[PDB]
Design a protein around this ligand. Structure first.
Ligand SMILES: [Zn+2]
Ligand SMILES: [Zn+2]
Ligand SMILES: [Zn+2]
Lengths: 523, 454, 378, 116
RNA sequence: AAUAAACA
């Protein structure tokens, strides 16, 4: 332009934040709070704006202490480099950022290097500790035979120009939440060839506490010794019990008490709890053991499919997950000691892990796949497209970008009285969610999403409708809050145009897209 | 029945990594990508928080990136990016000034059911390679269909070379690279025309092969110049050796070959599992006993290749060269150990990047020691919640007593990130929960300011 | 006699256990993204840990070339076995013999589990459903029985006045088709046992029937050289197509589960691929059966590869895109192979002779030497 | 532990309503079946059930003191006309035939009863 | 009880 003008521009960025409930400022720049510089965005949903030398923009909410009126950096003698703000109720709070996390990642994270493959984790609620299965690599030396009398172990005798196979020895750690070091004299190390297939936190019924349940840590584990040796397994039920600490080591009050450790008749692949019953998967069977004083007494079983590698359950409905064949829902009565098959999937499906989509009255069966999919099954006996209560039916289809193994539910923050956000952490580092909705609020947004899919210049020319297709009919019923997030990114002139083209105003949609952001601000 | 998917955490973890001219031709910029997200990192050297990877732009795709190559087109002021998405979608994109977004240059959809030859279950990923002179670029659609993009609008219309209708009946491709030197885009293609499995080597000894197809762009033919045909049965990735030596190194699981058109084959063995498994003439590498099956590699300017093995162990292979620019012998050195990688990039000379899914993918720095052994130092590490196998919800232990009677649950998640030597737990906690060290009850005031007084 | 009432000593058993392989894949697939990320199973006997099932190596289907012999599984009455199926749980293996017996052989470790006196005639056909619910059988007599998972005898009915030779099943529990030696293909109602329609106009005895996994196509094969392969239309009853493929006596016809490829065994030493959406041309033929190719079974978790029996007991393994065969047993399975059946995990294959035996075939172990009498007789 | 945070004990799901009155279970075909994999019908224990013989779920009778040996492996031809029990309690098994008749047993993990 | 032990 020649006359002398700014040789810069400005690009708007996506958000998650809404400002909806002398001159008061809401934008307070802070330098040197816990090493960080940036902006605390005050108001009804307060947020932090953190940019380190990484240069990436970080939006961390602060939903505790409610809405926040004002803010100030505070550096004192008795207080370290921290901050200082008003409550909405007029409460001045000297405050310090907690110093163990790192606020430079998209969520605040502290990395705990175990230097060994952590397979599972299980927050034991009583005494408040974590129980991690691990595995380190030991160079193998023996090859187990089974020649007719007992196991014979052939010593690997090879050249000195020879690399060895890897034998993995498993141990169950005990990580303490107070300071994140592991706890000494609490490491259940397993046998020579025994591999942990599952660790969970299992609540079994007992006559000691005032409730029934107790909250143990149960771990299943089996011995891998190649395909010629019959793999057998062993249920390892533990318990973290507070004893007196050693003088000088206050972490060592926590220590395992292994109640049950007995070899089973086959490999233990998956564990679950149902009203205080232990539900374990051995072979092509799923067992229902009950915890007595010292022995497990069997109560129910069913001859299930090939390899049941995930089971979770609630209110005596057991949801299994095979590697190839099918998920199943099972059902345990108490008055008759019987476990039985209610509905299974009938089609082959290469599952990773399963969940429970919970509606106000509907229970959906969120089942991730090998092919980076999610899908919600339901048990609908009155439907005619299945058999009469003998075949599950998918009712939503979606294509996550990544493989998913982890699954959990939470209550979200009258509508949303009884619906659960069934979150997940994908196997590429990302954490998603599936917030259920009703029929009206969905279709006011599917009209928006179809208007967002076509009339926008998407990155790399990609089609968001066909990417979030099932990748086998694709009975999709799941929106995309990363495409609907672009409606929050449009200018308010452009916002009103796509509202008129679908037959509404922006304020109805902004009351629909910001209420799927407010009820999902946990952690 | 209905739901909304919302993505609470963008996927950390880099499956692809390159070093191209993303913003302009003046500076190179580390473009790395992961599952359905592109990242462009600059390079600081004088940072307060010393070298540090500074993010410059990040981009979300509606599709998982399955490969990524770059080429500076005719008269362009930037470097385009050849992305590759699932079921054979190429997409040439560019950064734009003005609008700070991308800009798609071309869209190539190859998801035709006659391009599969009936094979519904696509197992091979579409692989994008570029000619280092910038003459053309080739995508291996579906394992059996070399799609060639000719270059000079800055483009030419593509075409689909059938792989199985070539000579030698290629039929099971392992890797393909554009080789250096030459006057035409010669593309080496490792394959297995009579496929075998490690575990069945007594009736099928060694079946890997090489064809260096030479692409005629204008006439649209392709002479299959140079073929070898009894390479060891378990060859992993091939790698194009640069111009002053030329040729190719072909990583096998238990050996390592150096092949060229005018030179006899020279390849050594790296353990004594090559005894009854290989008839190829293998020497004995002295003082080395390792394997190369998942081993990412890049090249130092000439005659030095950084192999990061499985197990995260960096070896700097030296190709010992004669006076006639032919490889005589190899030379290893066990350099430092580092991340369990999934990629590798030479940045500015003396910096390496180790893109990894499972582990904090970090920036290294090699120097010369006082033949030419390299010592490594870690300068910066991109934080990387790895493949979260299991993750459980826990309650934090330092909630301050003022926030104690709050009605909502106040909890965090602990994530089994990483694997192996880079395995971890990660403590993810979305909000920020301060430590209230002193509270006050001052009603009536509504704003606040802080000043500094000596 | 044999009744489980006399005592025998304690023995350890030859085990082919997929569980240390499947556990290994679950631990793998977390940190594996592809097969291009997989750690190699180096050829030595020490790498017995690093086996994953064929789902683990989708790439490289030569995993499942099952030439390692495990166990001859013979009865005590010595009848030649005709049909072989695995229970879709991968748990056992019902097998049909000429006296009409269903010997249920074990899966991980093979013993014997029960005998049955099912058919009054030699068993000729056996298929399960798409869920594990119902098993279909048929014989030389004309009787078709339904079987549960616990092998309960259900209402039986004379489907044909002459010898049935196959029965395949729609993608549900509603419809299936049995061809017989009167020359017709009769498509059946599942629940009512009601004769829906007869597909006449075929010429001579049709000895195999396939059903396409989605589109509703009944494919057949024939001894009649004039009308060898007929596609059909199950709702109407009309001849949809006719494919002149073989010189004599098409034995067994199998489609993929992906829905495209027809595969056809025949007594002229040939297996042939036909793309069913293009019957004018012809895909590759498969040459290498030195006598007649009498049994064919597609691999479950690998499309592309299948095993192919012989009338000389030759047991060969093929792959789509690969012209000559991969595996090989000749003069090795002795007799005439009637049927094959992979385990649901595609890792261990069965067999069945016109001799009175029925051998089992697991994958080759890493780093063994194939000096076995099936592989290299030296 | 999944029951402190996202508890569902107060929800009466449609899934639990679907399995009390059984929500349209079809009277099963082929009356020579087994009723296998099916739990129990509460309509028979409390009062008259409604359908006889051709019914989905299981009908129990008294005076069953010994569990069924075939039923454990998954082979129950008899079904509900079985004179043996179909639980999993390890106290109502038969006497082992080779410990009662032929002196000692052979295997190490014999489930069946050994009495002297 | 209807093949629990069907062994080389
Ligand atoms: Zn009833
Ligand atoms: Zn019984
Ligand atoms: Zn006994």
């Amino acid at each position: 332009l020649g006359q002398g003008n700014l040789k810069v521009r400005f690009k708007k960025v996506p958000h998650n934040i809404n400002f909806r409930e002398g001159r008061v400022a809401r934008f307070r720049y802070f330098e040197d709070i816990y090493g960080y510089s940036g902006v605390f965005i005050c108001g009804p949903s307060p947020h932090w704006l953190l940019v380190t030398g990484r240069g990436a923009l970080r939006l961390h909410p602060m939903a505790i202490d409610g809405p926040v009126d004002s803010f100030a950096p505070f550096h004192n003698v008795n207080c370290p480099r921290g901050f200082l703000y008003f409550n909405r109720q007029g409460e001045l709070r000297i405050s310090v950022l907690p110093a163990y996390l790192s606020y430079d990642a998209p969520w605040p994270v502290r990395k705990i290097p175990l230097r060994c493959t952590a397979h599972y984790v299980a927050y034991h609620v009583e005494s408040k500790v974590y129980a991690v299965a691990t595995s380190t690599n030991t160079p193998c030396a023996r090859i187990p035979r089974m020649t007719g009398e007992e196991k014979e172990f052939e010593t690997i005798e090879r050249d000195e120009r020879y690399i060895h196979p890897q034998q993995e020895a498993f141990s169950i750690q005990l990580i303490s939440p107070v300071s994140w070091e592991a706890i000494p004299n609490a490491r259940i190390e397993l046998q020579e060839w025994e591999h942990v297939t599952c660790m969970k936190t299992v609540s079994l019924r007992s006559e000691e506490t005032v409730s029934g349940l107790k909250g143990y840590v149960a771990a299943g584990t089996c011995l891998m010794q190649g395909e010629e040796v019959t793999c057998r397994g062993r249920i390892l039920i533990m318990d973290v019990i507070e004893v007196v600490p050693e003088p000088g080591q206050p972490l060592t009050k926590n220590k395992f008490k292994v109640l049950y450790e007995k070899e089973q008749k086959g490999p233990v692949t998956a564990l679950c709890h149902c009203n205080g019953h232990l539900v374990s998967a051995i072979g092509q069977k799923i067992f229902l053991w009950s915890l007595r004083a010292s022995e497990l007494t069997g109560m129910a079983f069913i001859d299930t499919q090939l390899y049941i590698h995930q089971m979770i359950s609630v209110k005596n409905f057991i949801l299994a997950a095979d590697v190839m064949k099918s998920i199943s829902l099972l059902r345990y009565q108490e008055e008759s000691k019987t476990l039985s098959l209610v509905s299974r999937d009938a089609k082959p499906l290469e599952v990773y892990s399963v969940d429970f989509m919970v509606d106000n009255a509907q229970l959906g069966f969120l089942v991730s796949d090998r092919d980076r999919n999610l899908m919600v099954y339901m048990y609908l006996p009155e439907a005619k497209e299945s058999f009469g209560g003998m075949r599950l039916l998918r009712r939503a289809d979606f294509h996550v970008g990544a493989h998913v193994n982890t699954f959990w539910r939470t209550p979200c923050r009258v509508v949303w009285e009884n619906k659960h956000i069934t979150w997940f952490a994908t196997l590429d580092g990302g954490i998603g969610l599936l917030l259920p909705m009703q029929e009206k609020t969905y279709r006011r947004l599917l009209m928006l999403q179809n208007a967002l899919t076509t009339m926008l210049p998407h990155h790399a020319g990609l089609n968001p409708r066909a990417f979030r297709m099932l990748h086998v009919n694709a009975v999709r019923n799941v929106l995309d809050g990363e495409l609907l997030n672009r409606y929050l990114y449009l200018s308010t002139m452009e916002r009103s145009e796509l509202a008129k083209k679908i037959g509404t105003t922006p304020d109805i949609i902004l009351d629909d897209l910001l209420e799927t952001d407010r009820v999902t601000a946990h952690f | 029945m209905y739901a909304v998917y919302k993505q609470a955490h963008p996927p950390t973890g880099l499956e692809f990594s390159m070093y191209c001219n993303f913003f302009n031709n003046s500076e190179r910029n580390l473009v790395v990508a992961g599952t359905s997200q592109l990242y462009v990192y600059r390079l600081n050297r004088d940072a307060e928080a010393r070298e540090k990877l500074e993010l410059a732009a990040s981009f979300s795709f509606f599709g998982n990136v399955m490969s990524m190559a770059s080429v500076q087109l005719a008269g362009a002021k930037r470097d385009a990016l050849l992305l590759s998405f699932k079921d054979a979608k190429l997409s040439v994109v560019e950064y734009d000034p003005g609008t700070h977004d991308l800009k798609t240059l071309s869209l190539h959809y190859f998801e035709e059911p006659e391009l599969r030859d009936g094979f519904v279950q696509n197992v091979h990923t579409p692989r994008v390679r570029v000619d280092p002179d910038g003459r053309c670029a080739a995508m291996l659609v579906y394992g059996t269909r070399l799609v060639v993009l000719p270059f000079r609008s800055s483009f030419l219309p593509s075409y689909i070379i059938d792989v199985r209708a070539l000579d030698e009946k290629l039929l099971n491709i392992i890797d393909l690279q554009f080789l250096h030197g030459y006057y035409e885009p010669t593309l080496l293609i490792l394959f297995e025309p009579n496929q075998t499995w490690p575990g069945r080597v007594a009736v099928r000894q060694d079946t890997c092969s090489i064809v260096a197809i030479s692409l005629n762009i204008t006439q649209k033919v392709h002479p299959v110049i140079w073929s070898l045909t009894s390479l060891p049965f378990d060859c992993t990735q091939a790698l194009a050796v640069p111009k002053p030596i030329g040729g190719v190194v072909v990583f096998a699981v238990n050996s390592l070959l150096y092949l060229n058109q005018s030179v006899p084959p020279y390849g050594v063995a790296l353990n004594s599992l090559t005894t009854g498994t290989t008839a190829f003439p293998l020497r004995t590498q002295e003082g080395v006993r390792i394997t190369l099956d998942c081993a990412q590699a890049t090249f130092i300017s000439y005659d030095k290749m950084v192999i990061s093995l499985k197990g995260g162990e960096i070896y700097v292979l030296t190709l010992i060269t004669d006076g006639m620019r032919s490889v005589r012998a190899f030379h290893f050195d066990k350099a430092a150990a580092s991340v369990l990688t999934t990629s590798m990039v030479t940045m500015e000379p003396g910096y390496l990047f180790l893109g990894s899914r499972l582990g904090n993918s970090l920036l290294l720095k090699y120097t010369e020691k006082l033949l030419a052994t390299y010592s490594f130092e870690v300068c910066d590490s991109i934080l990387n919640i790895g493949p979260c196998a299991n993750a459980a919800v826990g309650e934090p232990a330092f909630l301050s007593e003022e926030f104690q009677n709050s009605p909502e649950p106040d909890l965090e998640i602990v994530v089994c990130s990483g694997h192996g030597k880079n395995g971890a737990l990660s403590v993810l906690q979305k909000s920020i929960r301060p430590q209230v060290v002193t509270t006050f009850e001052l009603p009536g005031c509504y704003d606040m300011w802080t000043v500094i007084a000596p | 006699t044999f009744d489980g009432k006399r005592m025998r000593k304690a023995v350890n058993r030859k085990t082919i256990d997929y569980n240390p392989s499947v556990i290994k894949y679950l631990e793998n697939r977390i940190w594996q993204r592809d097969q291009r990320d997989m750690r190699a199973i180096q050829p030595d006997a020490g790498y017995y840990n690093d086996l994953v099932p064929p789902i683990g190596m989708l790439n490289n289907p030569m995993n499942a070339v099952t030439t390692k012999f495990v166990r001859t599984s013979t009865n005590k009455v010595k009848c030649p076995v005709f049909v072989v199926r695995w229970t879709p749980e991968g748990r056992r293996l019902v097998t049909g013999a000429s006296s009409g017996e269903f010997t249920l052989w074990n899966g991980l470790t093979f013993n014997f589990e029960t005998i049955l006196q099912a058919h009054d005639s030699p068993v000729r056909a056996m298929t399960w459903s798409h869920n594990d619910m119902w098993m279909l059988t048929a014989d030389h007599g004309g009787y078709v029985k339904y079987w549960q998972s616990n092998m309960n005898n259900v209402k039986m009915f004379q489907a044909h006045k002459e010898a049935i030779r196959e029965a395949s099943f729609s993608p549900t529990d509603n419809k299936f088709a049995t061809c017989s030696d009167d020359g017709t293909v009769r498509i059946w109602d599942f629940l009512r046992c009601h004769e829906e329609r007869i597909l006449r106009g075929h010429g001579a005895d049709v000895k195999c029937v396939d059903w396409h996994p989605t589109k509703g196509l009944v494919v057949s094969g024939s001894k009649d050289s004039q009308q060898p392969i007929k596609f059909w239309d199950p709702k109407t009853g009309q001849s949809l197509a006719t494919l002149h493929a073989h010189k004599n006596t098409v034995m067994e016809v199998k489609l993929n589960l992906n829905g495209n490829w027809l595969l056809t065994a025949s007594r002229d030493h040939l297996c042939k691929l036909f793309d069913i959406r293009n019957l004018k041309e012809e895909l590759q033929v498969f040459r290498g059966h030195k006598k007649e190719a009498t049994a064919v079974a597609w691999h479950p978790v690998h499309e592309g590869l299948f095993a192919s029996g012989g009338s000389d007991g030759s047991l060969l393994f093929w792959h789509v895109g690969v012209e000559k065969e991969v595996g090989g047993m000749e003069m090795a399975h002795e007799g005439m192979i009637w049927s094959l059946a992979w385990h649901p995990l595609g890792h261990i294959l069965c067999s069945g002779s016109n001799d009175h035996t029925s051998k089992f075939w697991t994958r080759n172990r890493p780093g063994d030497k194939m000096r076995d009498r099936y592989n290299l007789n030296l | 532990m999944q029951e402190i945070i996202a508890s569902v004990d107060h929800i009466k799901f449609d899934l639990e309503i679907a399995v009390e009155q059984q929500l349209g279970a079809q009277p099963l075909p082929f009356p020579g079946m087994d009723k296998s994999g099916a739990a129990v019908c509460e309509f028979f224990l409390k009062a008259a059930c409604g359908k006889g013989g051709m019914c989905p779920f299981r009908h129990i009778s008294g005076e069953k003191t010994v569990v069924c040996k075939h039923w454990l492996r998954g082979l129950c031809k008899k079904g509900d006309q079985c004179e043996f029990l179909h639980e999993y309690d390890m106290t109502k098994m038969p006497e082992c035939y080779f410990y009662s008749k032929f002196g000692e047993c052979s295997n190490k993990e014999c489930p069946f009863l050994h009495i002297d």
